[PDB]
């Protein structure tokens, strides 16, 4: 429609992630419970870097919010600004500086109506991850006979979320009950702060097994790639430090997931020119093999010169190893189980979940 928000409800949801912010404007209608239906993305804009990486002063906040919002084709609508793991790495005292400046920016203008601007927990983010994916799969309308699990592979945290009946023995913070479209859904949620790709990588930059042969490690040693070896190193951070296996595997053993979907960074890796997967799905076995043979075991100078257009390339041995460590050695997923990934051209994040669910923990 010419102006969609004249005939439908519209809100703006901003995903303020660790590596960038994404504005989405959604139009929707509501059913007879006032629940959104027919959700359509009418605009998006993605900027970098992340909000938490900028200096929190009025000039810098204005430049950033102007870049994010000023060219939108629709305004005069409510805005939800929800920041994720990049902000969670800062204490409340530091985050307050950002929100006081952001709140002032919104008060000083008239085109957007700020409703909320806050850092959400990783558990809230995980609920939104599951809602957004399941909305896109059309699995929310009716009671499913299949369990759908979602993983969001972010830059600073990763989330996992799947159906699990309410359990008096698990923290209330890791369990969510919602009623949507007249069904009652109970989920386990967990986020692992520091296990996102950027933050994790900072522990392995001097691991020769994690980089192509002769890659120049920052300590002056040479890469000598070997994905199974790098995977074992990353598993030590997953399990000896974060205890991912002990927290997740007993729960998935009791609440098996029939279909896994992943969003976040893994879509970019799996879709890159170095990897080959069909049907927008992968297995961990194939992901680790491809990284091992196409990056880890190659000569870095040669490979870098072959693929000059990919600034992410140098990390692909490490990332393929890390995803396997996280999914197989941490979550316990079978290396041969299909993991669907949402094509990156969709730019799909968790923001549709906010449209559907306005509460937070």
Ligand X SMILES: Nc1nc2c(ncn2[C@@H]2O[C@H](COP(=O)(O)OP(=O)(O)NP(=O)(O)O)[C@@H](O)[C@H]2O)c(=O)[nH]1
Does position 202 interact with Na ion (CB under 5 A)? The reply is yes
DSSP secondary structure string for all residues of 170-210: S-GGGEEEEEETTEEEEEEEEEEET-SHHHHHTTSTT-GGG
**Bond from prior residue into 46 cis (ω within 30 degrees of 0):** no
Question: Does the annotation flag 222 for ligand binding?
Answer: no
Residue 345 tokens read as 């051209």
Residue 72 tokens read as 């939108």
Does position 312 interact with ligand X (CB under 6 A)? The reply is yes
Among 36, 122, 163, 330, binds its own copies (CB under 8 A): 122
Cα angle value 200/192/194 (rounded, 5°): 30
Chain centre distance of CA 141: 24
Q: Which stretch binds its own copies (CB under 8 A): 21-29, 36-44, 86-94, 319-327?
A: 86-94
Among 34, 138, 146, 220, binds its own copies (CB under 8 A): 220
Residue 326 tokens read as 């996280």
- Given Na ion, Mg ion, Cl ion, none, residue 17, with its beta carbon under 5 to 8 Å by kind, binds Mg ion
Question: Does the annotation flag 317 for ligand binding?
Answer: no
Among 149, 154, 208, 344, binds Mg ion (CB under 5 A): 154
Among 2, 32, 34, 92, binds its own copies (CB under 8 A): 92
Does position 219 interact with Cl ion (CB under 5 A)? The reply is yes
Does position 208 interact with Mg ion (CB under 5 A)? The reply is no
In this complex, which beta carbon is closest to ligand X, that of residue 36 or of residue 154? 154
Asked if residue 226 lies in contact with residue 296, where contact means CB atoms within 8 angstroms, the answer is: yes
* Cβ neighbours of residue 48 closer than 8 Å, sequence gap 6 or more: 19, 20
Residue 162 tokens read as 């799947």
* Cβ neighbours of residue 246 closer than 8 Å, sequence gap 6 or more: 239
Among 218, 279, 345, 359, binds Cl ion (CB under 5 A): 218
Q: Which stretch binds its own copies (CB under 8 A): 1-9, 88-96, 128-136, 279-287?
A: 88-96
Q: Using the 8-state DSSP alphabet, how is residue 286 labeled?
A: H
Does position 91 interact with Cl ion (CB under 5 A)? The reply is no
Q: Which residues make up the interface to Cl ion (CB under 5 A)?
A: 121-122, 191, 193, 218-219
Binding site for ligand X (CB under 6 A): 17-20, 84-86, 154-157, 196-198, 264-265, 268-269, 272, 312, 319
């Amino acid at each position: 429609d010419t102006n969609p928000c004249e005939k439908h409800s519209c809100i703006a949801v901003i995903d303020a992630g660790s590596t960038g912010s994404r504005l989405h404007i959604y139009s929707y209608d509501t059913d007879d419970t006032n629940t959104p239906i027919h959700i359509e993305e009418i605009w998006n804009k993605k900027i970098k870097p992340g909000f938490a990486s900028i200096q929190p002063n009025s000039v810098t906040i204005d430049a950033y919010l102007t870049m994010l919002l000023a060219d939108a084709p629709i305004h005069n609508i409510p805005v939800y600004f929800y920041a994720t793991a990049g902000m969670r790495l800062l204490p409340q005292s530091q985050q307050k500086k950002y929100y006081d400046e952001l709140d002032y920016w919104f008060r000083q203008q008239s085109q957007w109506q700020l409703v909320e601007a806050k850092t959400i927990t990783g558990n809230d983010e995980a609920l939104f991850d599951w809602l957004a994916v399941n909305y896109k799969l059309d699995t929310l309308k009716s009671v499913q006979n299949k369990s759908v699990g979602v993983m969001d592979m972010g830059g600073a945290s990763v989330q996992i979320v799947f159906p699990m009946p309410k359990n008096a023995e698990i923290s209330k913070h890791n369990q969510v009950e919602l009623n949507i479209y007249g069904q009652n859904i109970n989920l386990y949620v967990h986020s692992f702060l520091g296990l996102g790709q950027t933050e994790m990588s900072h522990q392995f930059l001097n691991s020769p097994s994690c980089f192509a042969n002769d890659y120049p490690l920052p300590d002056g040693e040479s890469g000598q790639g070997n994905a199974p070896s790098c995977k074992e190193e990353v598993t030590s951070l997953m399990n000896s430090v974060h205890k991912v296996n002990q927290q997740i595997q007993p729960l998935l053993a009791l609440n098996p997931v029939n279909e896994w979907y992943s969003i976040g960074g893994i879509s970019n890796l799996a879709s890159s020119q170095l990897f080959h997967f069909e049907n927008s799905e992968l297995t961990n076995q194939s992901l680790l093999q491809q990284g091992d043979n196409q990056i880890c075991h190659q000569q870095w100078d040669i490979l870098n010169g072959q693929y000059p257009d990919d600034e992410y390339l140098y990390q692909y041995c490490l990332l393929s190893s890390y995803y396997y460590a996280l999914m197989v050695d941490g979550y316990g997923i079978n290396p041969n189980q299909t993991i669907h990934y949402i094509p990156p051209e969709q730019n799909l994040d968790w923001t549709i979940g906010v449209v559907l669910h306005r509460a937070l923990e």
